[PDB]
Every structure is written in structure tokens, then in C-alpha cells.
Amino acid sequence: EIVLTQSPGTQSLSPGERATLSCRASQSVGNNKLAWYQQRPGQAPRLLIYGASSRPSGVADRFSGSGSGTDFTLTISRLEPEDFAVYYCQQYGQSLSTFGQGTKVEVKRTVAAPSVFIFPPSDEQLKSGTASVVCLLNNFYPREAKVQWKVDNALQSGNSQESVTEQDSKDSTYSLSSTLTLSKADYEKHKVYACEVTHQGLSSPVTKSFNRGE
Amino acid sequence: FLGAAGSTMGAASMTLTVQARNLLSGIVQQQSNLLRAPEAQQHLLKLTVWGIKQLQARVLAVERYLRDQQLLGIWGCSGKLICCTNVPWNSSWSNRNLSEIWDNMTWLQWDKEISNYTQIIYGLLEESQNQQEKNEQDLLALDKWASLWNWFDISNWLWYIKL
Amino acid sequence: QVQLVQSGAEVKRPGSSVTVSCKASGGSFSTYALSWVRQAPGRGLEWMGGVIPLLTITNYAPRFQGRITITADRSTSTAYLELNSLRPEDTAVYYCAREGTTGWGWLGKPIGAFAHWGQGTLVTVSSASTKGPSVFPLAPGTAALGCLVKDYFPEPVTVSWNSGALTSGVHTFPAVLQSSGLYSLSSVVTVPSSSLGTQTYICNVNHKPSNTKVDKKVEP
Amino acid sequence: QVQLVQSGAEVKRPGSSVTVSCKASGGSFSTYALSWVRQAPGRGLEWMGGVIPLLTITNYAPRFQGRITITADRSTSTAYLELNSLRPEDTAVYYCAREGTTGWGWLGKPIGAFAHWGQGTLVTVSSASTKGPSVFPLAPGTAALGCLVKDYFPEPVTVSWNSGALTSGVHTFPAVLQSSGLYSLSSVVTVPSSSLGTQTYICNVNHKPSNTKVDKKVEP
Numbered sequence A: 001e002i003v004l005t006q007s008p009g010t011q012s013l014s015p016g017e018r019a020t021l022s023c024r025a026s027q028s029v030g031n032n033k034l035a036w037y038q039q040r041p042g043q044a045p046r047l048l049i050y051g052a053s054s055r056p057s058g059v060a061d062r063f064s065g066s067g068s069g070t071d072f073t074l075t076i077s078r079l080e081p082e083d084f085a086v087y088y089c090q091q092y093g094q095s096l097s098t099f100g101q102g103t104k105v106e107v108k109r110t111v112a113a114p115s116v117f118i119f120p121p122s123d124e125q126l127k128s129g130t131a132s133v134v135c136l137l138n139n140f141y142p143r144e145a146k147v148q149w150k151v152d153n154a155l156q157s158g159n160s161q162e163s164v165t166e167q168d169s170k171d172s173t174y175s176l177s178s179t180l181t182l183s184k185a186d187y188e189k190h191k192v193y194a195c196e197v198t199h200q201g202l203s204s205p206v207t208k209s210f211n212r213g214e
Numbered sequence B: 001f002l003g004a005a006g007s008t009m010g011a012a013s014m015t016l017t018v019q020a021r022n023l024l025s026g027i028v029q030q031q032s033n034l035l036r037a038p039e040a041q042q043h044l045l046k047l048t049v050w051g052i053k054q055l056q057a058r059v060l061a062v063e064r065y066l067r068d069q070q071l072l073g074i075w076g077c078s079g080k081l082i083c084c085t086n087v088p089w090n091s092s093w094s095n096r097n098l099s100e101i102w103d104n105m106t107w108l109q110w111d112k113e114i115s116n117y118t119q120i121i122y123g124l125l126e127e128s129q130n131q132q133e134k135n136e137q138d139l140l141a142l143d144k145w146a147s148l149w150n151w152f153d154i155s156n157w158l159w160y161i162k163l
Numbered sequence C, D: 001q002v003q004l005v006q007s008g009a010e011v012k013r014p015g016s017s018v019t020v021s022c023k024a025s026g027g028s029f030s031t032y033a034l035s036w037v038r039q040a041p042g043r044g045l046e047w048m049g050g051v052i053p054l055l056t057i058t059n060y061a062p063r064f065q066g067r068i069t070i071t072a073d074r075s076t077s078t079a080y081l082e083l084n085s086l087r088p089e090d091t092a093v094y095y096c097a098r099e100g101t102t103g104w105g106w107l108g109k110p111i112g113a114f115a116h117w118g119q120g121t122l123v124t125v126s127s128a129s130t131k132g133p134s135v136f137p138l139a140p141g142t143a144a145l146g147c148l149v150k151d152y153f154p155e156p157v158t159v160s161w162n163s164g165a166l167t168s169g170v171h172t173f174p175a176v177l178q179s180s181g182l183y184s185l186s187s188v189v190t191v192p193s194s195s196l197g198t199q200t201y202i203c204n205v206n207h208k209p210s211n212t213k214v215d216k217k218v219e220p
């Protein structure tokens, strides 16, 4: 087994930057057989460079593979707003194979602070005995941050999972929505619902304070 | 030309990482002096001493530089300076080490190693080049390339690719 | 060109087995290595194994060997994959992919790379049965707002506000394989506070196997 | 020198599975077309599909699909037949086949048709349990006589008369499949009516599933 291990992190580059990736493996693939696979979520993962050197008819020339032996290389000179996705490479050498680890390239604006909000649980689901306290992190950059809820003066981890959108191409920022599940009888008790969010832009953990009643 | 003939075959792996150290072009292109002037002379002299000696040397070089091309033709190696064969290293009794041969042994000492059985190897090579390989290739066409592959008796193709 | 119209996504009881199809169209069903790949819904990609229909050469998986079955039936010109022991960690998208060839066609020398592909369907096992959820006004210069499509079955729903008239500034959030046997979803947009009573923000949801598409008020 | 080493006989139930083997002692085995052909007693060679051990190329007979399990092994020099989900009509001699070779040798071009065989393996699939043979002698112008062996299960019975001395008139029959699935046999020894009194005529029946070697001297 050849554990293919590409290793740049988030390729947070500006539109128009040289998208150079690490693109290595555990050991050397036989006969340099590597294919280059662009991928978008929900679409077809598409071949770029077959044999890691030659490109088919129809694939754009700005895709360009290089390297040999154990670790290959992909460079992309111009960064278009549609190529900002996750990139992999995959061996067709030894009879067993695995794909790339995952490198996301994005639109790069500067670092920023959000407009934080939290939703109280709605009465329409509270009358069924199902509370849901939902935070919101609107128009922040970068995506990577941390969310520490204070539900009755305590840390929560296991009920408030996180749903985070990718970089919306209009505003070039991200959006987070953490959602904790609860019931109505606990909603009659809990007064503190304050997600203490930490970020480059959220240096101090702020709240949008509300209690049981609004 | 001949520039590392005294080196070991590992340092004469250097020779065949270049044009066998220029041996073949020195075979045919050292003719260029007697190619440049067997004819620049405009003199009568009524008789010729070199008219037999130079001519005998010339056609001797030509027949020697064609016997080897025909012998590479007879082992399917025509054109290729370095080619491999289906003849195995047989019961031939100079069985020894790989890291002894291609690291510490010159070409001349290697010729002194296998000075015997060399005509045995030369007779042996064309056997696997022809008597079954040419007959397998003659088999390989008297079957449709894309029509036999339905039988599930596809090994014949596999048999022709392993043995 | 080469079209690989995969069969649709499926729901099924866990612990049982599963079959999927991949009907090719164009090029050649045989003489080129059709194969099969995975990707967990959020992970990178993963190759499993393939088949070559003219000689039924099966090149199977390093780990899933013994539980995978790939066939090739050229007489009706399809290709099936049969996995077993359905489970929440068999949940991945399963793309069917064919090897491409040199030149613009489907007959010349192959390349060794997964050039032409198929649409793919997420092969996700089902725990519960269907469920129509309820949609809520999530109360907050700029008033935040959401329509929580929470604890339903099955995935997915979409969210469009005022029948898609409000189109910019949208921020949906993906459905979750959560810890209740159901599925939840969130979706927010950005409106001002002063236009609460003037413009009534009415999200529209589309849950197609549970059949609930209601207009829902947001007037916090 | 392609020689084939099978396994030993077995008694089983329907629905279970039997791993019978064919170890290739000698001969180029990994690249040649093995076949697994059984023969029910007195009928045609029932082909159950072969295998090439080089890339696991299982040419299947299209009538035993789903019930077959055919693999290969180069290290043990053995292809494995695994007839899962057995039936009582599987009672057959599980021969293992392998194609020949042009020549003049055992390494050249293959010919397709099977040349080499194993020792033959028998399955006796029945839910009746193992029994021991009970012989019952026929009492003696001549008047022939034998020994009725019965109440043995499974097959076979190996009768002996005078420890193999009287070798004429030992009409050796196959055991007939009786009404209750049982079997019977009588090697009826023909002797004249001049020595009906004293001379030894013993029926020694050995049955290796039972390991009972019954001795029985006949008497008028």
C-alpha cells in the first residue's frame, strides 16, 4: 500500500496567485503513473493531467503537473473564481490506490470580525417540547475559529454541533451556525445562552445576550 | 574512442551510458581518411601498389562491419545497441555474483571469463529468438485479435505473455 | 461523449446488502476498465476497485475485498456493484468512473486515468422512516433570521426566501446525520430590522420524500 | 509433469459448504486453465466452471451461479472449490481438470482440452447419520449364496470373501440407492453343491466411516 499524502493546508491565496501544492506519498509509485484530479462538491471529480505530465484535449492549460518518484507537484498560475476548490492526485501504478488528502484554495480577503447573532428557540418547536438554541456568525474571515458555548455557565460539546458554509463568492467571507438541541422544561430553567466565539476577528469572546423570555 | 576500455564494467557502465564509448562510430568513421582521398590523386604512375592493399583493407572492414549487423538481425536486435533476450542464463557454469560483475570487472577480464561457450551462446540465442518466438508470432495472427477473447480459454493469450 | 448515467440514491435497512448500477452510454462498455470509487460526504475521495468487461478481470480492494462484488453484463450493457453489510460507515458517495482514451473518442489507446465520469449518488443508509418537519421564524439595523428545518427524514431540503425573490446574501447550511435518528438543517439570510413589518420574509422549503412544501412566516 | 492432489471424501448436510482442494504437484500451474468438473455416478461430466490462477479469471458455467465459490492460491499450488449451499444431488466424484500442452513437454502452448486429473473426491450429502454395516448371509444342482449387508450409512461397503482368495464368482455390484436412502450389497459367491458343509466362506465387510470390520461365516 502506498499512502498518498499531499501536504499543503488551506491554500488561502489571492485570485491570481500561483497555486503550488506539495503532493507527496508514502513511497514511490511505480512507473510514475499518477493522474491529477480536480474536484468540486456535488460535481464530477475531473482529470487534469494524465501520467502527471500530459494533458488531454479540453482541460485548461493553466493546470500543470510536475514532479516524479514519490512526491509530485501541481502548479496553477492564474487563480480563477471557479477553480477555488479542493484538489487531489491519485496513483494508477501499484494495484492498490488512494486519493489526495485535501487542499482547499479560496478567495483571499483580509482578516475580519463578524456581525454575531444568536437565535432563541422558537415557540412552535418549544410547544412540542423541543428547544433549539442557534448561534450565527455572519460575514467573518477566515473560516477557522472556535466556538465555546456557555449554556448555564458551562462548556458544551456533543449537542451543539457546527454547520459552516463554504466561502460565498459574493461577500468572500464565511458563515457559521451552531445548533444545540434541548427541550421545553429545560428552557424553563436555563437563563444563559451565550456562545463564546473566539477568532482573529473575535479576539474577545462576545455575546448577544438573551434569556428565557425573548 | 576506447577511452575507458581499461575500466571495470561498473566504470564501463560509464561506457554504455555513452555510445558504448564511441566504439561503433569509430568503427565506421575511421574510414574517413581513405574515404577522403582515394581519388584526390591526379597522377598516372602506370601501376598501383595500394590498388590492391587499400582495397583489401576496405572490403575487409566492410564485411566485418556487416557480419555483426547480420548477427544482430538474426537475434531480433537490429538497430538496438543494447537489447535483451528470452534465452535465460542457462546451465552455463560461470554462474557468479551480480555485484562482482557489474562493479569490479573490466570488459577484457569478462572476455577472459566466458571465452568458452561463446559460440554456444551464439547458437543458443537465435533458438529462443526464432524457433518458438517466430512460430508463436505466426500463431498470433492466425486467430482474430478481438474475436477469440469470449471463450474464457484466454490463457493462450496469457501463455504467450508469461512463457 | 462518454456518459455514465448512474442509478439513483437509495435508502435501505442497515445490516442488509446493497446494489447499484452504472449504465454507460457512448464509447464502449467493454475493452476499457470501468471502475468504482468512494468519497465520504465531506472527505477527500477514495478508490475501491473495478472490472474489465471483455475478460471479467476484477481488481478488488485492499480492505473491502470479500465484501465487494463487481460484475459486467454486456448483453444489456450495464455494470453493477454489490456491497454488503449496510451501516452508517458505508455512507459515502459512490461515483462510477470509466478510463479515458487518447484523442477525442472512445476507441483509441487508453490513458490509465479516470477521464470520463458519472454523476454519482450518495449511498447513505436509512435508520428511521419518513417525517415531515416544521419550519420556524428564528428571532434575532440588521436583523438576523433563520428557518430551522430540524429533525426530519430524509435528506435533503432546500431553503429559498420569498419564493426566491430575495436571492442575494443567502447562507444555507448542510443537512446533518445527527444523533436523533432524524436529520436537521439550518439556513439564514441577512435582512435589516426596520423592514420587519413591511417586507414579510417567507422562506420556502422543499422536502420531496416527506412532501411538505409550506410557506412560513418570519416576523420576529 | 502436472499431477493433481485432491482432498478426502466428506459426508455433510444441505445448505452447508465443502472446501475440496486440487493441489498441483508439478507443472506450470499459475498460468494454466484449471477446471472443476464433477461427475454424478453413471452420467455426464457436470462442469461447474474453471479458473485461471494468474489474475483470478473465473470462467463460469451459467447454470450454477450464486451457489459456486471458486478461487485460487499460488503459494499452496492449489485452486479451491467451495460448493456452498449443498444438495443431495451433488453426490459425485469431484474431479479437478487442467488443460494440456503442445508436445513434447509440459511447458509450451496450451491446447484447451483437459489432460490431467486428481484422485477424485466424493461427497455424500444426506441428513441421515453414520451407521455400521450389518451383514446377513444367504444359506447354501448348485445353489449360490452371498451376504446381505444393510443398515450402513454412508457409502461404501468393501466386501471380502476368504480374505480375497476365492476371486471367481465374486460378482461385485454397486450399492443400490434403496427406498429409505439406504444401500445394500451381496457379492453372491457361486460354488458347486459338492462342498456345502465345512469349507470356509466368510463375508468380511469394511466401512471406514464406521470402523467396524464384521466377520461372518456362512452356514446352511
Ligand SMILES: *[C@@H]1O[C@H](CO)[C@@H](O)[C@H](O)[C@H]1NC(C)=O
Pocket: B003, B004, B006, B007, B011
Ligand atoms: C581507472 O580506475 C580508477 C579506479 O581506481 C578510477 O577511479 C578511474 O576513473 C579509472 N579511469 C578511467 C579512465 O575510467
Ligand SMILES: *[C@@H]1O[C@H](CO)[C@@H](O)[C@H](O)[C@H]1NC(C)=O
Pocket: B097, B098, B099, B100, B103, B104
Ligand atoms: C558480490 O560481490 C561483492 C564483492 O565484489 C561482495 O561484497 C558481495 O557480498 C557479493 N554479494 C553476494 C550476494 O555474494
Ligand SMILES: *[C@@H]1O[C@H](CO)[C@@H](O)[C@H](O)[C@H]1NC(C)=O
Pocket: B008, B104
Ligand atoms: C576491486 O578493484 C580493485 C581495482 O580495480 C582491485 O584492486 C580489487 O582487487 C578488486 N576487488 C575485487 C573483489 O574484485
Ligand SMILES: *[C@@H]1O[C@H](CO)[C@@H](O)[C@H](O)[C@H]1NC(C)=O
Pocket: B112, B115, B116
Ligand atoms: C576456454 O577455452 C580454451 C581454448 O583455447 C581452453 O584452453 C580453456 O581451458 C577454456 N576454459 C577456461 C579458460 O576456463
